[PDB]
Design a protein around this ligand. Structure first.
Ligand SMILES: N[C@@H](CCC(=O)O)C(=O)O
Ligand SMILES: N[C@@H](CCC(=O)O)C(=O)O
Ligand SMILES: [Cl-]
Ligand SMILES: [Cl-]
Ligand code: NA
Ligand code: NA
Ligand code: NA
Ligand code: NA
Lengths: 255, 253
């Protein structure tokens, strides 16, 4: 049967290129939590697949002037991919246009920053400008701020938008580098913060979770794979396989 | 006017309770709690009216291993005796095979409720002994997790619970709490509910961490068009901060 086209994006420890001296080809190039998830889905549901990195390098957001989506979300809308297997947040605006499986991981937006400071919350960032802050451009965190009616988050969006050329970044890796090299706090998903802080002992999460969301496998609207993948996820959960996969990929610091 | 939706639910504090009052209350006005607030928001957002009915058999729902039939709220949905189940109803593999669920409105996991002052630190410590009894709600998701599990510690625990089921499987979380308070018994309980109970009784504690991860969702019969509509409403409520506000209201040692 036809191999499913799977769109994804590079994001440690979910999706990475394998390190090797020999060139690698096709699906053999990739590893990570989401790649292990994809393999399990493929065995349980009985499909073959071809992994393709999203052409525009984006997760996906809607253009405020012309209304078009980009990123992996757009690839699904346009039926250029069968599945998006990635750390792809399930959100209201996305669920209006694509389908998602139920979540394989739960998380929330939080703050990555340096240690040893009096900053304890989003409110503390919002009320000042000396410490800059931002998010990945055209992802779910950005969109949460852009849409929020909550006073603190609306104030933060106004700042991000004003300073966007500097404070909105194209990847989590770029955001981490800004935290490490400038007076900057990065609004980042908590799952990824846990990974980063385990490996960067001078960085920490600031405050708690700002929201609650899950990552799900994306499908075009109406796809029969959506509910089948939900069932496989729920079975993998029940068996303890997702927890084992998280422990494998998240693997510390003195304290 | 459109037919009012029949909403099955179950009494479970602080999700669904009878309001305290001296005058008798009628109809929907009888009920309050997190899930009642959720239902009200869903009805306003999706434009339906409803009638709340407590599940007739008093159960969440499990499948009988001999005759293959479901019970509880799950069975009421299968049989189209209710349009929705709005309750702390766990989304599970075996249930999703036979009913549909919205995406989760709250996440949780199984954990352990026990009295303070103990060296017992985990499910492994419980499984290795028999002086302290342990159990779960009969015909709910926790019981089913143990009954199905192939993980050595949990399979051992199920063998004990099954052997002693007339004593250690209980009919409600409230009965489980009373057993913890009145005997040497540890209760396998969902974490959200433990959080509520331990804030109210400072002699009790959670033991260990979460054994699994799951969500509560609104149940619908398989194929229902309300499922995806309710998912969207829940995602919008999330994004506005209303679910966290509802949790703070009802969970407010
Ligand atoms: N996981 C996000 C990207 C990262 C972020 O927005 O923080 C998404 O699905 O858009
Ligand atoms: N919330 C559970 C009942 C309680 C439990 O099993 O711990 C259910 O949906 O079955
Ligand atoms: Cl798991
Ligand atoms: Cl769903
Ligand atoms: Na990337
Ligand atoms: Na959708
Ligand atoms: Na289902
Ligand atoms: Na004791």
């Amino acid at each position: 049967n036809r191999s499913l086209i799977v769109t994804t994006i590079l994001e440690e420890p979910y999706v990475l290129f394998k390190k090797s001296d020999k060139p690698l080809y096709g699906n053999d190039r990739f590893e990570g939590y989401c790649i292990d998830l994809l393999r399990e889905l493929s065995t349980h549901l009985g499909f073959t697949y071809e992994i393709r990195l999203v052409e525009d390098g984006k997760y996906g957001a809607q253009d405020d002037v012309n209304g078009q989506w980009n990123g992996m979300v757009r690839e699904l809308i346009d039926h250029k991919a069968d599945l998006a297997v990635a750390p792809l947040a399930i959100t209201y605006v996305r669920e209006e246009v694509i389908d998602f499986s139920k979540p394989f991981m739960t998380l929330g937006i939080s703050i990555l920053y340096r240690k040893g400071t009096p900053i304890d919350s989003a409110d503390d960032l919002a009320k000042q400008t000396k410490i800059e802050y931002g998010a990945v451009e055209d992802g779910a965190t950005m969109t949460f701020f852009k849409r929020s009616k909550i006073s603190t988050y609306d104030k933060m969006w106004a700042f991000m938008s004003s300073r966007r050329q500097s404070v909105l970044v194209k990847s989590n890796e770029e955001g981490i580098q800004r935290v490490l090299t400038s007076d900057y706090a990065f609004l980042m998903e908590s799952t990824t913060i846990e990974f980063v802080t385990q490996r960067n002992c001078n960085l920490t999460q600031i405050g708690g979770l700002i929201d609650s969301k899950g990552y799900g496998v994306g499908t075009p609207m109406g796809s029969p794979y959506r509910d089948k993948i939900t069932l496989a996820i729920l079975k993998l959960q029940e068996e303890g396989k997702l927890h084992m996969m998280k422990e494998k990929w998240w693997r510390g610091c003195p304290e």
